[PDB]
Design a protein around this ligand. Structure first.
Ligand SMILES: *[C@@H]1O[C@H](CO)[C@@H](O[C@@H]2O[C@H](CO)[C@@H](O[C@@H]3O[C@H](CO[C@H]4O[C@H](CO)[C@@H](O)[C@H](O[C@H]5O[C@H](CO)[C@@H](O)[C@H](O)[C@@H]5O[C@H]5O[C@H](CO)[C@@H](O)[C@H](O)[C@@H]5O)[C@@H]4O)[C@@H](O)[C@H](O[C@H]4O[C@H](CO)[C@@H](O)[C@H](O)[C@@H]4O[C@H]4O[C@H](CO)[C@@H](O)[C@H](O)[C@@H]4O)[C@@H]3O)[C@H](O)[C@H]2NC(C)=O)[C@H](O)[C@H]1NC(C)=O
Ligand SMILES: O=C(c1cc(OCC2CCOCC2)nc(C2CC2)c1)N1C[C@@H]2CN(C(=O)c3ccc4[nH]nnc4c3)C[C@H]2C1
Ligand SMILES: [Ca+2]
Ligand SMILES: [Cl-]
Ligand code: NA
Ligand SMILES: [Zn+2]
Length: 805
């Protein structure tokens, strides 16, 4: 109910709301069916169209017209965006050369340059190059302002998860919009694009930009436009808002376009019918810009041009049916399409089994086009698990395909030729970013970055303090001329011990053997300097990492590698070593195959033991610094110290062995030496954050030796590869991964072939940012380099994606 009986005269697109039932006149009333009777007549005028014509120049103001070409229009703030070009001989914004904007040039009374966020749905990143001949306004923004060749959305690359990530800097798992379609079991409700449920504030977590602004006394234009309000009216309304008196005028504005997404779904991303939606978007941009120029705001406002996701070629016949795998296909509810999510059709059913469903979906057909996962086993870079709204079972679907439950679902629902929602590393899903204005740089290209980082920047552009979010504040400082936020290195919380030789061999009773009793003062002061950290500048290139939580740990030095050994988790938190281009792969000598030696620097009570691995029929063990890469027969003994040991399932040891024996050396060859940091990760509650000791669900049997959920490595070298890793005078280059530590290899369908046919593809899949590894371990890397901190934050947010160009 509304008493939809009040009026809207002088209230057209009002700025604060009114309580039901007083009728509404804001840009969302339509969607609430709560506009006043006269809203259309007064607020949605159309008479005469949206441009001036020569014979309108001068005219008697006529309140009926959608826009005015009269004389008092400039001062009423309601001319058609082309008024000056047509009636005062001015030029369109796009025809003007660009001139660097060194300082804001704003009208008197503007306390700060406004921000205008112009967002475009489905605007695939390659559109910038491929549609360039027909988007001249967008092209001028891109080349005069600051731009990335593309910007990475979050997963799933759906509309609501992405628009609300842009608004909040949060992963969908934390903001709560985990799909365009969700079931919440605690609310017992569903959320869909169509319908009222999405209007209930209980779905939306985090604190979006417009709320952050309000709470700190920066006024916001209302970001959301009802779908019948056409584009030209949205632009005119923003331009009017911009004419309000100083005390009423918002500081931040949003425009949203449903194009090109709406068309991309019908015609595919490069369909002939796509040229027109693009021209249209360009023309709307020209109108905002010709309108800012009229108001002398075009060298004052910062404009952000940003997409939520891209678009891919998808058709009804590229659909895989779950009914071709599962016999019980009626006890399951599938959330379907470009990703799959499965729950039980009823929780009154005690016969519903995730394991057998997963197994029934694993590697069943030669060319299968989706892969099932338990959510905690999805790649950590998707950050897609820590929400009750995300179903335990998930299917990652290949680009260009759909998954559906039955065929009846597809023909009682080819409609479409495009879709999106796939893995966020996929090229066709990448989207756009352009920043133009006094606060952005002039004609500057920046590297690709993730859309989670933008909320921070929009907060800086407005002088706001960001609510806590998943961006890394400072990682996009290179986008900006000024306003920057000066980030600082977090303080180290635990400082290490440096233990010397304190224990005799016979104090150990670990059930470990080593064939090593084989026996010169010259080579002795030598081996001892290695244990004092003589070679430490070679293996520890960027400083030791900082432990950012409270705990007990020791630095251990060796000829070949250095480690931070945790007395709590009984293993190292990190192991650092450099492999130069020249270095040589040796084999594990036969005599030393089962060798594990006590560390006389570390007490029996803080040590693992071999007995437990023997007793544990599931669990075997590996080494963090690989014996294969020892610099000498003598140094190799160090690789076998029990303090270099970590627990590993036999299935995982195949992955790990291949990475250490083949791939390190290969990377050293291509990158001209690599520095490697490796270590264990514990995330039993899949929240993306380091577990405390009391959260560990699994131990090597009959011991306090905790089992990692994943193993990471960070592989750094010189960006200029003509310099070796250990003597780089400039920027660094990095790639990393976080491998799930799994007792089987059901994830790789080719895992019964040689490791050279599958291990590396798996690693690629589990590519990571150094920043993801920091969250997971509580460590802080790259503490001592010659680079600026800003540049290091950018490096820590890099993801190496292995897509082509
Ligand atoms: C990405 O960035 C985000 C944001 O920075 C990071 O998430 C933060 O991480 C913190 C650490 O996990 C977490 O802090 C906790 O908050 C608890 C209360 O928080 C409420 O208030 C805030 C502030 O305004 C609000 O944001 C929260 O909103 C969540 O919940 C509602 C649903 O109820 C959602 O609508 C909303 O979208 C959001 O959902 C998400 O968050 C929750 C976690 O709160 C998840 O469970 C969901 O899955 C969803 O993803 C909250 O309403 C606070 O009570 C916690 O305190 C406990 O632990 C500390 C240890 O310091 C201790 O002092 C206390 O004893 C306490 O323990 C007690 O509570 C336990 C739980 O009941 C109980 O088991 C014990 O026995 C005790 O009784 C804690 O400080 C913070 O909430 C989130 N923020 C957000 C927005 O998610 C995120 O980590 C980053 N991600 C990565 C990978 O880096
Ligand atoms: O008006 C907004 C809006 C705009 C915003 O913008 C947020 C700003 C945040 C700051 O950065 C830029 C965007 N945020 C939010 C929601 C998140 C709160 C909402 N809407 C209205 C549009 C209706 N719509 C569709 O019909 C549609 C479109 C594409 C599709 N593909 N497949 N099915 C689809 C269905 C997508 C909705 C987005
Ligand atoms: Ca955790
Ligand atoms: Cl969805
Ligand atoms: Na074992
Ligand atoms: Zn869409």
């Amino acid at each position: 109910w509304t008493a939809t009986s009040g009026s809207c005269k002088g209230r057209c697109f009002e700025l604060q709301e009114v309580g039901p039932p007083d009728c509404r006149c804001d840009n969302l009333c339509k969607s609430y069916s709560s506009c006043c009777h006269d809203f259309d007549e007064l607020c949605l005028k159309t008479a005469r169209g949206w441009e001036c014509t020569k014979d309108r120049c001068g005219e008697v103001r006529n309140e009926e017209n959608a826009c005015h070409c009269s004389e008092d229009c400039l001062s009423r703030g309601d001319c058609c965006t082309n008024y000056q070009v047509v009636c005062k001989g001015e030029s369109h914004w796009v025809d003007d050369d660009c001139e660097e904007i060194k300082v804001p040039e704003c009208p008197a009374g503007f306390v700060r340059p406004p921000l205008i966020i112009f967002s475009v749905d489905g605007f695939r990143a390659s559109y910038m190059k491929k549609g360039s001949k027909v988007m001249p306004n967008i092209e001028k923004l891109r080349s005069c302002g600051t731009h990335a060749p593309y910007m990475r959305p979050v997963y799933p690359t759906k509309t609501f998860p992405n628009l609300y990530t842009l608004a909040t800097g949060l992963y969908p798992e934390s903001h709560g919009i985990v799909g365009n379609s969700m079931y919440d079991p605690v609310f017992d409700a569903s959320f869909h694009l169509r319908g009222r449920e999405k209007f209930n504030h209980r779905w939306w977590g985090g604190q979006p930009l417009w709320i952050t602004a309000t709470k700190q006394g920066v006024r916001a234009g209302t970001f959301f436009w009802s779908v019948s309000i056409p584009h030209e009216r949205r632009i005119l309304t923003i331009l009017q808002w911009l004419s309000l008196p100083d005390n009423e005028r918002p500081s931040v504005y949003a425009f949203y376009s449903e194009q090109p997404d709406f068309s991309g779904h019908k015609y595919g991303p490069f369909g002939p019918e796509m040229t027109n939606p693009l021209r249209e978007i360009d023309k709307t941009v020209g109108q905002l810009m010709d309108g800012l120029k009229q108001l002398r705001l075009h060298r004052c406002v910062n404009v952000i041009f940003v997409g939520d996701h891209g678009m891919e070629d998808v058709t009804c016949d590229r659909t895989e049916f779950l009914s071709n795998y599962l016999t019980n296909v009626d006890d399951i509810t599938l959330v379907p399409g470009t990703l799959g999510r499965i729950r039980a059709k009823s929780i009154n059913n005690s016969k519903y089994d995730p394991k057998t469903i997963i197994a029934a979906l694993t590697c069943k057909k030669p060319d299968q086009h989706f892969k099932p996962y338990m959510k905690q086993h999805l790649p950590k870079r998707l950050h897609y698990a820590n929400n009750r709204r995300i179903e335990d079972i998930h299917l990652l679907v290949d680009r260009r395909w759909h998954v559906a439950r039955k065929p009846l679902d597809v023909y009682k629902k080819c409609f479409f030729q495009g879709d999106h929602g796939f893995d966020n590393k996929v090229n066709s899903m990448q989207t756009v970013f352009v920043g133009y204005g006094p606060t952005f740089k002039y004609r500057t290209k920046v590297p690709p970055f993730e859309n989670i980082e933008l909320y921070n920047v929009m907060c800086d552009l407005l002088g706001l303090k960001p609510a806590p979010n998943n961006g890394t504040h400072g990682s996009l400082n290179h986008l900006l001329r000024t306003n920057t936020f000066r980030p600082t290195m977090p303080d180290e919380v635990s400082r290490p011990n440096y233990p010397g030789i304190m224990y005799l061999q016979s104090e150990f009773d670990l059930g470990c053997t080593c064939d090593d009793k084989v026996e010169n003062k010259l080579e002795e002061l030598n081996k001892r300097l290695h244990t004092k950290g003589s070679t430490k500048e070679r293996h520890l290139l960027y400083g030791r990492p900082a432990v950012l939580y409270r705990t007990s740990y020791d630095i251990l030095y060796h000829t070949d590698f250095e480690s931070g050994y945790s007395e709590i988790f009984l293993m190292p938190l990190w192991t650092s070593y450099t492999i130069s281009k020249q270095a040589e792969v040796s084999s594990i000598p036969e005599h030393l195959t089962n060798c594990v030696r006590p560390d006389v620097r570390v007490s029996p009570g803080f040590s693992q033991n071999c007995l437990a691995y023997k007793n544990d029929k599931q669990m075997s063990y590996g080494f963090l610094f690989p014996p294969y890469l020892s610099s000498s027969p003598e140094a190799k003994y160090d690789a076998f110290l029990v303090t270099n040991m970590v627990p590993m399932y036999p299935a995982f040891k195949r992955v790990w062995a291949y990475f250490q024996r083949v791939l390190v050396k290969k990377y050293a060859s291509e990158r001209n030496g690599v520095n490697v940091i490796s270590g264990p990760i514990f995330d039993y509650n899949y929240d993306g954050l380091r577990d405390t000791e009391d959260e560990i669900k699994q131990y090597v049997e009959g011991s306090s030796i905790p089992v990692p959920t994943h193993y990471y490595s960070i592989i750094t070298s010189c960006l200029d590869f003509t310099q070796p890793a250990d003597k780089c005078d400039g920027p660094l280059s990095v790639s990393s991964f976080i491998l799930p530590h799994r007792p089987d290899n059901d994830e790789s369908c080719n895992s019964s072939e040689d490791e050279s046919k599958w291990v590396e593809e798996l690693m690629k899949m589990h590519t990571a940012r150094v920043r993801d590894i920091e969250h997971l371990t509580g460590l802080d890397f790259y503490r001592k380099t010659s680079r600026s901190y800003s540049e290091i934050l950018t490096l820590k947010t890099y993801l190496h994606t292995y897509e082509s160009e």
